[PDB]
Symmetry: D2
Subunit: 142 residues, 4 copies
């Protein structure tokens, strides 16, 4: 059993990102999202699946989907921003298992990733514990 | 803009269902899930989309997905239980837009629905406000 | 270190009780409230303190304070209802350390307790795990 | 009726502050805490009362209590850090109605306040809406 426990950091009072969606991919017996001691915890039965979180800032018309998983026993992550209204986390989560560019992001098995939106704001995932059964990550909103 | 505000009633202290997933379908400019005063609020851009909540009772190996939406300007709902390990809310929500047995349920535009799992536990949705932009429902776990 | 993990059951769709307050008494180095996997978790460094939760049903003008703690290495609980507007959880929690009738409730070290309000609705605390470091309780709203 | 809607910004991925306590003072018919769209909402019956939030970073042995209220029809705020183990939000909130050094802070009716703990970490409250029934504030953790 894997857990990925995520701490969210909003670094500037410019805009306000709120959680709006949390999804689980169907592989490796699925998985769950729990809130535990102020953290978002993704639990998976083993390697080969993932889950996504979407955050929205209605004040500034900004949003992103952050995806976390394990591929061949190594943690991975990605962030997608500049979302269309059709790009919910339900949509994005699935793309990592069929869309070549997204497949590659998962295959990269990154301990850290960052991307900025068209408005200039950067988002980052940083795994602080990168090995073992209880992985930990910071989700940093710039 | 539509909202569906959901109050969850867990009625029986045998097992414990916890929220594990909340999804948004991509049609009608998508949507969001918010927690508001102890309720789950699904907000949608217009008619033709939906969102799902999955609950799991790990103590008793039980689970269900409850889906809420608006089809042709009328509210709808459905519950799926006796889930396989592959049937996350991400999977189930999407099935309402392509899978015949799910399409028909959506097209029924029900104000109430109930189902029992193999263990005999009843799950129910009852809309308490069935008209207008701001709909309300009870989700009752038996 | 003690934890008391509380599962809330709302047994009837009549009214809707929502969480509005959570307090920690100052003895035995205080304590904390956490949300963990859908449960309310009170953590205390040792015996001799407590914490309170207040729930309100605005629909029906009902409310109660539920208090949980450990006294001389035995768990205790109490519920106060028919609250005046001045009886917040901050107020009620403290009364178990100075008010004779409340002191007695704590000294009783109950594994279960129930009380009904003037409107006829009953509330109950039921400890399902009554011994050890990780205590568990059902909070049942009738 | 007053509301104070609070957005929490945790700006630095060194340590992690989690919400552990939320209290309501007894004056002006008390009040409630609600979670609304990712924000903390303190609702009060009238002028002359307050509510407190405690946050703890267990990883770095840091904590603070942030208090928000209305005094003589003007909003006020304060932060207390470098807390002893006995100083829960239950304790701190009550001190604003009897303890001279706390009374004076409330009477200042501040729209903004900041303080640093012994480790040099800054905590700040800034009201973004300073007039009317529905007030807004940022709680910024440095």
């Amino acid at each position: 059993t894997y857990t990925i426990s995520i701490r969210v950091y909003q670094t500037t009072p410019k805009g306000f990102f709120r959680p709006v969606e949390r999804t689980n991919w169907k592989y490796a017996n699925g998985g769950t999202w729990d809130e535990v001691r102020g953290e978002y915890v993704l639990t998976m039965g083993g390697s080969g699946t993932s889950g996504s979180l979407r955050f929205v800032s209605s004040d500034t018309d900004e949003s992103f989907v952050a995806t976390f998983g394990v591929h061949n026993y190594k943690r991975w992550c990605d962030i997608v921003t500049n979302l269309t209204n059709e790009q919910t986390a339900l949509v994005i989560n699935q793309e990592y298992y069929g869309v070549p560019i997204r497949d590659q992001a998962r295959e990269n098995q990154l301990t850290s990733y960052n991307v900025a939106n068209a408005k200039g704001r950067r988002f980052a995932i940083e795994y602080t514990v990168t090995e073992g059964d209880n992985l930990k990550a910071n989700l940093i909103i710039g």
